[PDB]
Structures are given as structure tokens and as C-alpha cells.
Write an enzyme that holds these catalytic residues in place. Structure first.
Site, PDB file in Angstrom:
ATOM      1  N   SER A  31      -5.845 -33.756 -13.670  1.00 30.90           N
ATOM      2  CA  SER A  31      -4.430 -34.439 -13.719  1.00 30.90           C
ATOM      3  C   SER A  31      -4.250 -34.580 -14.913  1.00 30.90           C
ATOM      4  CB  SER A  31      -4.628 -36.048 -13.013  1.00 30.90           C
ATOM      5  OG  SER A  31      -3.394 -35.684 -11.369  1.00 30.90           O
ATOM      6  N   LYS A  44      -1.283 -32.693 -16.737  1.00 33.86           N
ATOM      7  CA  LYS A  44      -0.241 -33.428 -16.475  1.00 33.86           C
ATOM      8  C   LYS A  44      -0.244 -33.280 -18.138  1.00 33.86           C
ATOM      9  CE  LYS A  44      -0.976 -34.909 -12.255  1.00 33.86           C
ATOM     10  NZ  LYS A  44      -0.287 -35.942 -10.670  1.00 33.86           N
TER      11      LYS A  44
HETATM   12  C1  LIG Z   1      -5.514 -36.556 -10.500  1.00 30.44           C
HETATM   13  O1  LIG Z   1      -6.145 -35.673 -11.092  1.00 30.44           O
HETATM   14  N1  LIG Z   1      -4.770 -36.949  -9.616  1.00 30.44           N
HETATM   15  C2  LIG Z   1      -3.589 -36.729  -8.795  1.00 30.44           C
HETATM   16  C3  LIG Z   1      -3.067 -38.966  -8.902  1.00 30.44           C
HETATM   17  N2  LIG Z   1      -3.982 -39.133 -10.063  1.00 30.44           N
HETATM   18  O2  LIG Z   1      -5.567 -39.096  -9.954  1.00 30.44           O
HETATM   19  S1  LIG Z   1      -6.023 -40.146 -11.454  1.00 30.44           S
HETATM   20  O3  LIG Z   1      -5.735 -41.945 -10.991  1.00 30.44           O
HETATM   21  O4  LIG Z   1      -7.432 -40.219 -11.564  1.00 30.44           O
HETATM   22  O5  LIG Z   1      -5.061 -40.308 -12.314  1.00 30.44           O
HETATM   23  C4  LIG Z   1      -4.166 -38.478  -7.706  1.00 30.44           C
HETATM   24  C5  LIG Z   1      -5.653 -37.635  -8.060  1.00 30.44           C
HETATM   25  C6  LIG Z   1      -5.779 -36.176  -8.462  1.00 30.44           C
HETATM   26  C7  LIG Z   1      -5.258 -35.553  -7.797  1.00 30.44           C
HETATM   27  N3  LIG Z   1      -7.072 -35.394  -6.367  1.00 30.44           N
HETATM   28  O6  LIG Z   1      -4.087 -34.996  -7.114  1.00 30.44           O
END
Ligand SMILES: *C(=O)N1C[C@H](NOS(=O)(=O)O)CC[C@H]1C(N)=O
Length: 261
Positions: A43, A46
Site C-alpha cells: 500500500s 499509493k
Molecule cells: C496496503 O498495504 N493494503 C491496503 C490496506 N492497508 O494496509 S495498511 O493498513 O498496512 O496500510 C489493507 C492491507 C493491504 C492490502 N493487502 O491490500
């Protein structure tokens, strides 16, 4: 150095692979641990996508206000904001805020699509001087985090330099830089990661990430009390695919870094 030995000891006790890059912009000094090894961004990618859409808004004055259809089929694995707007619309500014501050994966996919696919995010990275970053897939498959897989990876050094240019340098216009920093500072997901290893009086804007292989990431701009800002990237990934997250390791790395400042 003592910081090097301690980050190595943290990694050794973690059972995984840790990458850290600090830039101290008071004097541009750097602390690196596996700073040139690739890690799955998950993530944290992003940030780049939002910055790329912010960059687009510099020559599309009305772009961040433009509606985007959220359809039922668009929802993926984590849509805390987008699911509220299915069969409706979100603006690209709202999608950027959802992606950065809530890590909404449908919002991230809307940002990616606005850039013409993952290659448009990579192209923006190249356009701001980042040669290492690559985004290859959309959500949710960009989070597979497979060892040895170069897709959707970067290095700590490259990401630290890029985050500095985006938030503190001039990769973006002034309004867009301030907007990116505002979004990062309002992150909701960061209090257990770099933030936890830093003194409470320090202001942090950050983006967390996680993925398969217990991948646990954070990238942060830090405004310490009475000193110029720091940029701190801490990537962490583990040997087993179903491994549990380890945000405490990011906090430990940040705490080691703070003591070396
Ligand atoms: C990004 O890593 N993702 C989107 C969302 N956020 O993770 S975080 O809480 O560590 O920012 C859900 C987990 C992850 C994903 N697997 O999509």
C-alpha cells in the site's frame, strides 16, 4: 556503526528481512540498512499514485474535482470508503484521500486507472527522477510480495529520496506538495508503525502498507521538534506467505533511528 549493528540485530531477532532508509534534511545525512535491496511496496505505492494524480492536476486545473463512478464490480479486498459510494461517484481528490488516509484499494485502483494503468504510476516515478520504483499490477494483486519477485517493489533508498522530493522537494507544485503532505499527515493507519518509535512531540505524515509474506511497510516524513524534517522508509517482509504483520518491527527500527539522530 552502532545504528547499523542495532538494525541488524532487530532484523535478526525478527526472523525476516528489514530495509531502512533515513534522510536527515538538516544536513542530508543518510542511514541505510539494506537500502538498495528491493521490497514489495504494497500500500505504500499509493503515495506515488496519489502524487501522480496530483501532478496531473497541475495541468488539468479541474481534475481533482472530477467525478469517478464507483461500481459494485470495482470493489476489491479492502474498500472502507469506496464501498460507501458504490453506484455513486467519488471525486479524484476524495479517491486520493481515501487511498492515502484509509488505504482504500478501490480508490487506489481508480487512481491507477486515472494514470492509464500501473505503467502510468511507474512513468510518473521516472518523470520525477525515481529510477528504481516499479508498479506492475493493480489492487489487490500488487500485494503478493513474493520473494525475489521484482514486480511492485522499490528500494528503501529510492523511496526515501522520492518521498523527500514529493513532500519536501519540488517534484510537485507548491499547492500539490502541500496537499500531499496534508493527506499524509491525516493518515489513520500509522500509529503502530514508525510513529510508535518516535517521540510523541514529533509530527509524522506517513503511509503504511502490508501484504503477503507478512510484509509490513511504512514510509514517513517526520517533523521533529525544533529540527529540520527527516524522511524514514522502513520495509519489512518475512519468509512465510501467511506470516503475521509486524508493525512493532517498524516501530523498533524508527526508535533505533531516532536515538541516532
Ligand atoms: C496496503 O498495504 N493494503 C491496503 C490496506 N492497508 O494496509 S495498511 O493498513 O498496512 O496500510 C489493507 C492491507 C493491504 C492490502 N493487502 O491490500
Amino acid at each position: 556503526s552502532a545504528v547499523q549493528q542495532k538494525l541488524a540485530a532487530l532484523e535478526k531477532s525478527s526472523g525476516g528481512r528489514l530495509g531502512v532508509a533515513l534522510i536527515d534534511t538538516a544536513d542530508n545525512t543518510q542511514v541505510l540498512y539494506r537500502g538498495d535491496e528491493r521490497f514489495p511496496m504494497c500500500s505504500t505505492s499509493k503515495v506515488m499514485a496519489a502524487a501522480a494524480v496530483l501532478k496531473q492536476s497541475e495541468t488539468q486545473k479541474q481534475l481533482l474535482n472530477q467525478p469517478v463512478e464507483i461500481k459494485p464490480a470495482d470493489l476489491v479486498n479492502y474498500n472502507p470508503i469506496a464501498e460507501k459510494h458504490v453506484n455513486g461517484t467519488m471525486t479524484l481528490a476524495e479517491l486520493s484521500a481515501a487511498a492515502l488516509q484509509y488505504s482504500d484499494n478501490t480508490a487506489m485502483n481508480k487512481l491507477i486507472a486515472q494514470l492509464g494503468g500501473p505503467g502510468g504510476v511507474t512513468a510518473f516515478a521516472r518523470a520525477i527522477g525515481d529510477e528504481t520504483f516499479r508498479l506492475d499490477r493493480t489492487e489487490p494483486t500488487l500485494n503478493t510480495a513474493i520473494p525475489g519477485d521484482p514486480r511492485d517493489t522499490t528500494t528503501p533508498r529510492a523511496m526515501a529520496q522520492t518521498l523527500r522530493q514529493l513532500t519536501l522537494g519540488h517534484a510537485l507544485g507548491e499547492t500539490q506538495r502541500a496537499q500531499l503532505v496534508t493527506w499524509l499527515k491525516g493518515n489513520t493507519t500509522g500509529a503502530a508503525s514508525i510513529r510508535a518509535g518516535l517521540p510523541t512531540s514529533w509530527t509524522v505524515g506517513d503511509k503504511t502498507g502490508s501484504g503477503d509474506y507478512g510484509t509490513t511497510n511504512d514510509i514517513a516524513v517526520i517533523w521533529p521538534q525544533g529540527r529540520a524534517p527527516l524522511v524514514l522508509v522502513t520495509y519489512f517482509t518475512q519468509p512465510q506467505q501467511n506470516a503475521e504483520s509486524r508493525r512493532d518491527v517498524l516501530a523498533s527500527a524508527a526508535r533505533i533511528i531516532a536515538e541516532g539522530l
